[PDB]
DNA sequence: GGGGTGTGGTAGC
DNA sequence: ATCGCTACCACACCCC
């Protein structure tokens with residue numbers, strides 16, 4: 352048990368934070384792509400016809416945590432009991448629930464108390480601990496399998512549990528659905544054996560947006576092949592609005608009142624005009640949502656195939672800590688700001704870059720929000736503020752960066768005990784070259 | 790036109 | 803108890 356003002360707080364919070372493990376796994380996957388394909392150039396051109404295999408583990412954490420469960424859960428049955436991965440018993444986020452749990456309508460992200468209340472009496476929720484190293488190991492088996500199979504020209508990290516895999520079809524050869532239906536089976540089986548029992552689902556299409564939607568139609572433990580020539584009302588009607596890329600809870604809300612509450616992608620499909628759509632959710636987002644409702648990708652999304660190196664290169668670096676923030680005085684806020692900058696400088700140095708620009712974001716307790724929110728150590732309800740500072744010459748100096756960071760907090764005006772959350776960023780990054788003379 | 794900003798949206802949760 | 807993390811783009815304005 353470690354308070355925010357203990358020198359050890361950052362290391363411990365990161366050791367238990369599944370969100371931190373997720374972002375770091377993500378980040379390490381993107382660097383290994385940039386080292387593996389440093390002199391390879393098997394990227395996607397417009398001269399290429401390609402198919403997208405979008406591959407993802409079914410209830411990833413839930414599965415790995417069950418497969419590696421301690422002897423205390425030996426009798427747990429993974430297709431018979433609702434299983435969640437979580438820290439706690441009340442206001443603890445469910446990082447992953449199995450599909451037994453999803454029948455009762457439990458979702459990823461809910462709290463244990465909120466998922467328990469949806470089970471009928473006589474049904475027990477099972478809560479497995481996080482198994483972070485096993486998550487990492489299993490993922491490694493997944494990416495090793497994909498590359499070993501020798502059937503993709505580009506393998507794109509999406510996640511600890513996801514990749515977009517591109518196969519180029521030479522125009523001599525002729526692709527068919529039984530050929531496709533059957534790479535899927537090879538992939539699913541090979542990953543199953545390699546992961547010692549984890550299952551993946553695959554969506555397969557001539558577009559990223561259709562492979563994403565197909566992947567969702569395929570889950571659990573299955574695969575869906577849906578090309579643009581296969582589109583039907585039956586397809587669109589099997590999706591809700593935020594199933595679509597580019598649609599989070601706010602865009603979703605905006606669409607639901609500009610178009611008389613569409614309930615399936617088919618509804619939205621038949622009721623929308625491009626121009627009312629732009630005016631409702633924003634023009635660029637609206638042109639992507641319009642493209643997506645036809646199965647076609649956007650130019651912003653296609654870049655990941657044409658220059659995946661430029662897309663997956665890290666253009667900023669940052670930490671976020673919005674849990675357990677309870678400082679009493681400014682001296683403690685500064686020391687923790689200092690310990691954050693040193694951690695970020697460690698990351699900046701491992702990648703041999705400087706930063707031109709930093710940013711501090713913070714969360715401040717809303718004036719009438721309780722000082723302790725329902726969630727233990729939660730941020731509670733907060734307004735956020737941020738400020739940025741452009742540094743003269745790019746640097747990796749702790750003196751300069753930490754001092755400007757503490758000044759950006761001194762400037763935002765937030766009393767130490769109203770602090771509930773901190774974010775520390777390095778924005779513009781420069782590679783350190785061989786010349787360093789003025 | 791270019792450059793900047795803080796806020797807010799999506800994505801991967 | 804409980805561990806609410808990162809990275810990118812879009813936008814509405816301001817500057818020269």
Ligand SMILES: Nc1ccn([C@H]2C[C@H](O)[C@@H](COP(=O)(O)OP(=O)(O)OP(=O)(O)O)O2)c(=O)n1
Pocket residue numbers: 369370373407408409410411412413445446447448459460512570802
């Ligand atoms: N709100 C969330 C969503 C996901 N995760 C973690 C746990 C997941 O196991 C992992 C992968 O995310 P996915 O979106 O792929 O969800 P799942 O793999 O758990 O289930 P599925 O993809 O079959 O729907 O990310 C989390 O911690 N909090």
Ligand SMILES: [Mn+2]
Pocket residue numbers: 407408409410411512
């Ligand atoms: Mn998954």
Ligand SMILES: [Mn+2]
Pocket residue numbers: 407408510512513
């Ligand atoms: Mn996933």
Ligand SMILES: [Mn+2]
Pocket residue numbers: 592593594595596597598599600
């Ligand atoms: Mn959505």
Ligand SMILES: [Mn+2]
Pocket residue numbers: none
């Ligand atoms: Mn997901």
